[PDB]
Design a protein around this ligand. Structure first.
Ligand SMILES: Nc1ncnc2c1ncn2[C@@H]1O[C@@H]2COP(=O)(O)O[C@@H]3[C@H](F)[C@@H](COP(=O)(O)O[C@H]2[C@H]1F)C[C@H]3n1cnc2c(=O)[nH]cnc21
Lengths: 175, 175
């Protein structure tokens, strides 16, 4: 349904174009930019997928143990008539007991914001109960696309709320 | 169907966020940046909608009478966890008889590229004959959204090929 189009839009528009050349940007930050004494940013992009489609624009305000650190070197590309459309990513540190536990490239999945707004607009004909299924369908289709296509550059983090920093840390430790 | 989700994604993700503050950027270029002797960039964003979903990334190569001139001051905003996600636009001149006939902010509609790629991917389950209807449906839904919501900042340019520069000029002269 709606999520299926959004999922393919996510892969074709964003993931297919920045994942193949994301590792080099992380290398460039770690070697040439990252502080000489602060470890290394992980090699994988971690994507948050709140199934309730609550996607705040500020990750740091969504968890005090998460806070912005730096940005990777931005990726530019001529896209659909725009000269040097800029694809940017933000590096975040994760705090356990007040000490930096992990640093990675972390962001939410924007199409989930699109689903949430459509449920809020009268003309979209989208319901709140419809949204929760589309949120799940969006992740499934995204998983199917990434299964058979770059690889090992993207880890999906889905969660439903009855610590987000502990949730993300939990994924970093597994690899 | 698929286009309906893409159309609302286009409005919620891009148009709702740059159209309200596009006029000021055009003012800033025209006054502080644009060459003292080259006229004024038009106040409206013109969006190309090729119904065949052929969207080249280089506008200039799609018509020799169209060629890149400059970029507007980029718009930045914290979006879905990304700090200072950059929304950029490119200014183009239109050539009639080899003399500059018009200058405006021109770009293609990216979701049409997404539709085209889905028709090319086996897992998307999207057909070429399906695409042509979805391309038309995408424009209709986009027209419906813009009808009852900013306003007079965006002109849609749809066309089917049996001069793109003459086609765009035709729209500038009407206002
Ligand atoms: N700056 C801009 N210039 C020109 N057009 C733009 C811009 N911004 C948005 N649009 C248009 O608006 C819709 C909705 O996009 P939204 O933001 O909802 O998310 C999009 C979609 F899910 C899909 C892109 O597919 P596309 O067909 O391009 O659709 C877009 C496009 F038509 C992936 C995702 N995505 C794209 N880029 C980034 C990024 O840098 N970070 C994080 N996610 C990103």
């Amino acid at each position: 349904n709606v999520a299926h189009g959004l999922a393919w839009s996510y892969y074709i528009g964003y993931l297919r174009l920045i994942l193949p050349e994301l590792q080099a940007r992380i290398r460039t930050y770690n070697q040439h930019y990252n502080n000489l004494l602060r470890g290394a940013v992980s090699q994988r992009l971690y994507i948050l997928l709140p199934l309730d489609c609550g996607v705040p624009d500020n990750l740091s305000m969504a968890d005090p143990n998460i806070r912005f650190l730096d940005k990777l070197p931005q990726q530019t590309g001529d896209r659909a008539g725009i000269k040097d459309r800029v694809y940017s990513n933000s590096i975040y540190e994760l705090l356990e007991n007040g000490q930096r536990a992990g640093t990675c490239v972390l962001e939410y999945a924007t199409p989930l914001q699109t689903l949430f707004a459509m449920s809020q607009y009268s003309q979209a004909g989208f319901s709140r109960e419809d949204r929760l299924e589309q949120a799940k369908l969006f992740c499934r289709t995204l998983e199917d696309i990434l299964a058979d296509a770059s690889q090992n550059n993207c880890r999906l983090i889905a969660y439903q709320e009855p610590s987000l920093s502990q949730e993300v840390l939990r994924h970093l430790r597994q690899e």
